[PDB]
Symmetry: C4
Subunit: 31 residues, 4 copies
């Protein structure tokens, strides 16, 4: 199923945004 | 081929969970 | 739906290039 | 095409390994 693929894509993308949000912080803790 | 795409999907997910965790020890050690 | 899957693919790729670059300034600033 | 999807998956995965390799370093620069 293609919808299944898309869906796992959506979740894959989610994780990258969260990963982007923990770099923002790590960047900040290091001023 | 879907069993493939499907495998690589979870493989992709599994490494984003590892990367998320790697970044999560850095950011605490940093704290 | 393929145009979707295909979009989200490049969207996924584009953020991994950003994350790679974020991590790349950290690691030099660190140096 | 499914093969196209797979292929972008392969490259997506590539980037995550490289991303794993620049955390290894950033981790090390911070002892």
């Amino acid at each position: 199923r293609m919808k299944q693929i898309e869906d796992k894509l959506e979740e894959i993308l989610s994780k990258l945004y969260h990963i982007e949000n923990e770099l923002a912080r790590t960047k900040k803790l290091l001023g």
